[PDB]
Design a protein around this ligand. Structure first.
Ligand SMILES: *C(=O)N1C[C@H](NOS(=O)(=O)O)CC[C@H]1C(N)=O
Length: 463
């Protein structure tokens, strides 16, 4: 079996992320080795192996005709060994993977097993494209959708934010709302795929795709989309939330800011009123809200074929009582990933058209599905822009130079969420920030979005 050169993984711009690099493996015929047995200690020594352990192995495999001595040496370490002229000690020309961007893109790229077979991330998800057949024809080059500049910016800013708010884990997703491309996907903690002899299993977790949480107030825009499509609600319509609590038989819904009476629909998002969103949910029914949430992909299969990727659960109760109707509308009757939430915000930002997710470079954009009507999506866009701009809004998420739109929330162990997109008047990027915890994340959205849009030469719309 003559191993094949493995396809190069680059980022969307050609920066190398996984490189098949030639190495020398030394193998040995044990039967031939029992012949040159006064040579073993020199072989053992030049292999870094204990003389008696080395002798025990050879003696143990005395029957066999093929064993490995060392895998993956550089071509002149193995050159030095066979230059010792030991009978029965030969060569096999293999390839080892090296990951030049290291821990910056570890979870997305993944890595190979000892036999150069895809074991995590893109390396696994596209193993057949990348492998090609042993002898021996070489695998195929793959350009990810990741932009290493945006990835590094997200990685650096997310790690800082965890160090600021004393947090341990978290993730950040950046998406092209127009093409479906995942421009950045970064997790903390992360790990160096070039030195994974010693890496904890918690840092191996691709949180953005695996960590499932109730998204809370971040799905209020979708509950509000259902409201605007029902035909019973215009943006300037009024809901009375006084006194910030609402009794549902036994349950009591409680707002965080209990300082309002009448709120228009934008006000319900600015103040993030569970009372107001529930009252609207009672009026329109949970079926409409479930439908928008399912249509934008919340709790649905992302279809990336990514290893480990989880789906969450959007339960289709078919008929919802009042309590489950409200708990769905303000985001605790479902479970999602950061990737699903970003895809949903992408659909909202892309004038209600959902373009399918892609972890590889998209040259020919597939046609999307109009999942939210363009009028409703553009209305909700304006409301979310008011959530960031307006008085009492999430000011720490404002992006200097541009108009940004978005929604904070608390996920549920809790996590701070910010989901948003920019620029508000011709959106290009959706972003989801997840910081695990024992408006933390709105500043990170601000920093990372400011840089991402500038890296993409997106002209300021705040003129
Ligand atoms: C949303 O996640 N929730 C509703 C409310 N919104 O506040 S926020 O704008 O900081 O997200 C308070 C937090 C949470 C909830 N506990 O119901």
């Amino acid at each position: 079996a003559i191993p094949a050169h493995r396809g190069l993984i680059t980022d969307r711009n050609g920066e190398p992320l996984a490189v098949s690099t030639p190495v020398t493996t030394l193998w040995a015929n044990p039967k031939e080795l029992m012949t040159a047995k006064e040579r073993w200690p020199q072989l053992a020594a030049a292999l870094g192996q204990d003389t008696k352990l080395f002798a025990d192995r050879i003696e143990q495999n005395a029957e066999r005709e093929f064993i490995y001595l060392v895998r993956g040496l550089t071509p002149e370490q193995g050159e030095g060994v066979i230059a010792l002229k030991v009978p029965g000690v030969y060569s096999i020309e293999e390839f080892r993977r090296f990951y030049p961007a290291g821990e910056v893109v570890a979870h997305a790229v993944g890595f190979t097993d000892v036999d150069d077979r895809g074991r995590e991330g893109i390396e696994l998800a596209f193993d057949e494209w990348l492998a090609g057949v042993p002898g021996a024809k070489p695998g195929k080059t793959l350009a990810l959708s990741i932009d290493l500049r945006l990835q590094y910016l997200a990685h650096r800013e997310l790690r800082n934010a965890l160090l600021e708010n004393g947090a341990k884990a978290g993730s950040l997703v950046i998406m092209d709302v127009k093409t479906g491309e995942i421009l950045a996907m970064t997790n903390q903690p992360t790990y160096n795929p070039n030195n994974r002899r010693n890496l904890q299993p918690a840092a191996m977790r691709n949180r953005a795709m695996i960590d499932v949480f109730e998204p809370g107030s971040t799905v209020k825009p979708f509950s509000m989309s259902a409201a605007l499509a029902s035909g019973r609600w215009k943006p300037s319509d009024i809901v009375d939330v006084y006194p910030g609590t609402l009794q549902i038989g036994r349950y009591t819904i409680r707002d965080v800011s209990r300082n309002s009476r009448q709120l228009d629909l934008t006000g319900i998002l600015i103040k993030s009123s569970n009372v107001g969103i529930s009252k609207i949910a009672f009026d329109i029914g949970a079926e409409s809200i479930y439908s928008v949430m399912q249509q934008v992909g919340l709790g649905q299969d992302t279809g990336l074929g990514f290893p480990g990727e989880r789906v969450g659960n959007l339960p289709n109760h078919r008929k919802w009582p009042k309590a489950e109707t409200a708990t769905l509308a303000y985001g605790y009757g479902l479970s999602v990933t950061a990737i699903q939430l970003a895809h949903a915000y992408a659909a909202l930002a892309n004038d209600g058209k959902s373009v399918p997710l892609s972890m590889t470079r998209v040259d020919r954009v597939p046609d999307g599905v109009q999942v939210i009507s363009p009028e409703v999506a553009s209305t909700v866009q304006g409301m979310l822009q008011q959530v960031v701009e307006a008085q009492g809004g999430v000011f720490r998420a404002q992006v200097p130079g541009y108009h940004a739109a978005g929604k904070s929330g608390t996920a549920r162990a809790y996590r701070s969420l910010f989901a948003g997109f920019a620029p508000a008047t011709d959106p290009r990027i959706a972003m989801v920030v997840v910081i695990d915890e024992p408006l933390v994340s709105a500043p990170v959205f601000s920093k990372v979005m400011a840089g991402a849009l500038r890296l993409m030469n997106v002209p300021p719309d705040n003129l």
